[model samples]
Target: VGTRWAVLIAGSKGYANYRHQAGVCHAYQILKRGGLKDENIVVFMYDDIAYNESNPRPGVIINSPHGSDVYAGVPKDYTGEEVNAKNFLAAILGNKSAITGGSGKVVDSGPNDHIFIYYTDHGAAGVIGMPSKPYLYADELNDALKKKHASGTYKSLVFYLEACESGSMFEGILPEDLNIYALTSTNTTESSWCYYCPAQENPPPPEYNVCLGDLFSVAWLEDSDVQNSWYETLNQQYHHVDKRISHASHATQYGNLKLGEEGLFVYMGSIVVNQRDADLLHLWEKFRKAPEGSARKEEAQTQIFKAMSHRVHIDSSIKLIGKLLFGIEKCTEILNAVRPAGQPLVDDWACLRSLVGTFETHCGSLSEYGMRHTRTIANICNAGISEEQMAEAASQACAS
Candidate 1:
């Protein structure tokens, strides 16, 4: 039999993205509890939140509503600034020497081994953030997976990713025949929802001050360990999660559809995440020991006020950037950005890469909240702006 190897990653840092790191920790616990040796699993997290001054719980990390700690016993392979796309791809491709720090472990898989990769982070139409700009691009991710497959690294590889429009990172890019399968928390055109969030708990009285988990990630992880949760196949998990997550976005699958017929436990282990204590809780349960004065109530109130402020700033910035980059009249004609948008996005990866790089060079890393303009970048590319112009215009707008 081949060795079973796994890589778990959390691509974001900070309190607002606490759920991504927690989701990775939960995945690690599942793999460890599934009985995989520590050496066989690799973990990459920006590792900022646990010690962050904003963390309400300090070192402990939780994944669900009143959930158990998932951070304990988790291995730290790559943490802090070292957790980047370079190392994540290196770890999976078994390029140990290319990796800068951490456990110094790589996939080291054989042609017969099974590989599992779980990543949770903030995503845009065709990429996921690594706590910075120059986010991991779909073309690059696809190339990495294909490279590994071409090398005959494993018998099959499974990927689970959670982020806004995460499915865009893989759909139509990963080859179905490569014995690879991917499941994303949300489809190509919508935002993924956060669950077990203090923002969603019973109003005014709930306890926590952060989001507990991501909707689809918690659902799949929770489903993996449910007591006799007969639904074993990936399809079941996908569908089960589909029903349990936000109504605003749809969960999606890509690559070999038939591979989903196999039980997810076969890949994710049946033990772990503390077993039956595992629940992703779609409902916003009331946890008001003090009545609806804290948690969701307080959080909702806070978000309402902040969102108002946040929108003004964001809208003002986008408009300012647009007016400067494309001129007032042309700015309105540009892609006319929409919330749930992007048409599977562009090809000619080289051009996109160059434009993105130039923007990053002058403007900043185009990721996380910065990625809201990815479509704008795409629009610029479609409109035939020279790379130099693209960079100069972007820098002009950003540097203001």
Candidate 2:
């Protein structure tokens, strides 16, 4: 039997994204209780949720409506500013020297070890959100795994990725021979759902306004909490999660198919979405419940308005850039086009990065919601738009 190593990451920050961190905490509890050593498990969370001002129960984070606190005893190996792509990649590759902040605990395993990684947050066509700038791109993530595979340090790796359009991360890229079995909460072109929000049945307490867990994350984690993990195959777990998460998005799998036949004990040792719109649902309820004309109501109203405005701005800006790069006539086609099934978003990942960088430089931050436009950017890349063209268009479209 190989040694078990796990990495749990929550790539989002803020009170509104309570479920991301909460889900990761619940994951840690499962792994810890599953007999994995804390030293062997690496966690990457922004670490801002448990004691957030809006939290009714300070220092306690739960992943279910009436769940026990999942925050306790969770190792804070990487938190706050340290939770970035570079650190995450470095941690996975076991490159201790490359780590910047927080504890430098990495997945230093031998050829006989198995690695499990779980990442949760908002995502788009080709990128997953980080707390700050430089979102984690799918290419870079897969590249890191490629490097890890080349290093020959682990026997097998299992990844559970929870985010919007998460399937695109490994859809056409991950090699099946690598012995890496990956599961994503949603396929490309769909939103991942959040659950146990204020508006849902069996929701969190009235004092709590945020969702308790992501739909996909809650399904698997809660299942692990009650199932005989050692007796279940990874395929069985996938089916259970896929079936339970029936609506919002599909649970897709990639990489080594044969690994699904392996027992959870091999890698996970044992363990564990609502749509993106569920965020809006929670915000609406908050605005409706707060007393009229009070600061709470005003703040709630502001939150709702700001969210709407952000989408409006992002939608318009993307269209403007599309029009500028390609002629106005071609803009609609470029922006709305989706690549054929079984194809990666772009042939060159660098093109996607160049476009994102240039856009952010001339326009502004591609905030969480803005990530949804990455498909448009990838589409632009697929259209053969050059870096300079994107820069020129972004500059003109977002000119101050």
Candidate 3:
């Protein structure tokens, strides 16, 4: 099977010069590694090679002196790179349409295609652009994708954004059953940086000079010789770069975009691939249904615990399973602590105090477990809920 198609938008002008360079380098690497075909890749560069000589600032300047301008030289003070990127991505992955100059021809969905999109630029309030005129508002972009999804055009969509405060844009659009995964560089107000670039002579631009997006892409493509899963590669890259550039005060990282079977925005991380396998789901169901205190329940719990423990030890699966096992252990501790102590009753006030302290500890553990498990379930369900539901059903066995 051939690798899926990808559309890359690197709006590398204005304040995003560093980020744009990084993105372009990453695209080049992707092409070099045969990860994507040239036709499948679309890049947009918005460098300040040419500035608006006329009508300097005030009103929206729609013309420029540069012929290499994609936004028609119209100095709108915003980057429309993502618009072009999505348009082309939607074209090839959605249908055979074309997106040029940040606009695309309307087309139908292509169910067999997998889409990859990347964005790197300046941002404000989920909007990546300048103050005078904003380009590609978060809602606008998401609404466009949602429309494409409603049309049933593609099988999977992966979106990555490397901009300041980009994570805020992903809030409401993450549906549970859609095969769409969206990742942003940082939480609202947190700015991300570019590493492999020089600083400007002036006071410096509003964004960072570190190219985290590019670093991530390179790691995703070449690191581990492509043996590692996408999520694993991304995590490694994020942490590696995060530590290396820790001095940059504004460095941020985000990832793990997972889409559900129905094209819904699921979890933003690795997904459970064998969720639809009846045998696996059945085993999970059995384990979930085992009664608490019964031998079968003990066996079921032990199996699950062992599997989770093993997963945690495995480097590739640790990010997912470690969090899960931690929650389980916490829940076990809580349940044990809260249970009443009706033993011999031989001690007195001192024994009662110790027992009460133990009970409090257990209760705290259980509460922590419940909170963590609920979050995990939400993430898993976002990817596709059947497996999570099975786990939930099995959890009933723990009830008194």
Candidate 4:
């Protein structure tokens, strides 16, 4: 595979009054983990706040008396200033092709080499821009990326858009066979909030009092454990901290990534994973009806193991459970394979039933592993499976 390219766009303060400084921090963390050198990464920041030439800050800011309040409590001083300047200025000063002014830049999908785009800012109707009178449109952004696709640029694109209505842009724009994944902070009707420096000697109106962006960044970066992939870790952290915030907010992912040959677009997370558990419940009903001493009984068991093994291979957190299940399934397959054509139906049933019971026993101790695997997959694919269904299936198998 070629070196992965990432574009970090932060519109903190300007026409679109988004808190992009936090986004810059997030991009830096992602780059560090992906092992991409700073030079290879492209950052675009636009805000009214002055761009520090020594340390370029590219986020836009509204003219608040409390200084450029691009993000709540980020301070008009070093932290906010340096991050924005460094991110934006580096892009401007680096490759000439990477630079664009105002909304045109936001909507301009210049080239196709980028594998990842991390955009953080304010959004309305799927378009993210400054709060200023003139704003960038979601359609324009879709057009730009489509143009890049037309030119054969990106193969797999992962977008982390921390803005309102971010999901709206995904409709009808993505190309077939292009792996485009987008994660939005909220729905079209929801507005993202940020906290102002309450302790500041002089703060803005109470309306701008809440802070939001950094929490997501911190949860995605600092708080998550190393064992999880980028998707799983981020999902865990979002729930952990988002629950503490006393506001109504939700996040969503839009894409066409599939788990199998099934055409359904998967929704990955805890809530959705629970729903998949419901599907497993339906499957268990059929399993329970499988006639004893019938060939269908063996077939059902084979399919169950195949499905479980497939899930285990795809998710590392459940590798142990997968292995154990595979062992039991293999043992059952061996028994079936060695059986003679004239073997007594009663003997075959006894052997298969014994194996199924063994698998069921293992599943009881392995439910945690299965649940975690389901959670991780759901987060990535945006599909949900249930713990209850899994438990019930194990119980039913044991009873058989």
Top lDDT model:
2
* Per-prediction TM-score: 0.82, 0.95, 0.44, 0.43
Clashes of each: 8, 12, 25, 45
Which candidate would rank higher by TM-score, 1 or 3? Answer: 1
Which candidate do you rate higher for lDDT, 1 or 3? 1
Cα lDDT of candidate 4 equals 0.40
Native-to-model Cα distance after best TM-score fit, residue 54 in candidate 2, in Å: 0.6
Evaluated against the true structure, the overall lDDT of model 2 is 0.87
lDDT of 3 at 383: 29
Please write out the lDDT profile of model 1 over residues 1-400, one tens digit for every residue: 5777999999887666777889988988877777788889998988887777756677888887667888888889998887888999999999988898788989999998889999988777777888764578898898999999999979888899887778778766777889998988777767776666544542211445556777778888887767332356778787888887746468877889888887765666550121101111211222232257567556545545554554455445555655666666754556565433333466565666787777667654454555656656665666666687766666666664
Q: What ranges in model 2 sit over 4 Å off? A: 270-275, 327-332
Cα displacement (Å) at residue 140, model 3: 0.4
Candidate 4 Cα outliers beyond 4 Å, as residue runs: 14-18, 47-114, 130-134, 172-177, 195-218, 223-247, 259-400
TM-score, ranked from best to worst: 2, 1, 3, 4
| Best first by lDDT, ranked | 2, 1, 4, 3
lDDT of 4 by residue, 1-400 (tens): 3445556666544311323554554445545555654444554544243343212234433323243333332212112233232223223223235433322122222333335566666554334553231233454455555555555644455666665545544544444455566556655444443333222333334433212133333334333323244345334444554663225345555554431222111111111111112223323433566678788667667766766764554343233333322245654212222212222212222232233234335343322123222212122112122344333434443341
Q: What's model 3's TM-score?
A: 0.44
Model 3, runs deviating above 4 Å: 1-3, 12-18, 47-109, 130-134, 197-400
- Report the poorest 10 consecutive residues by lDDT, candidate 1: 271-280
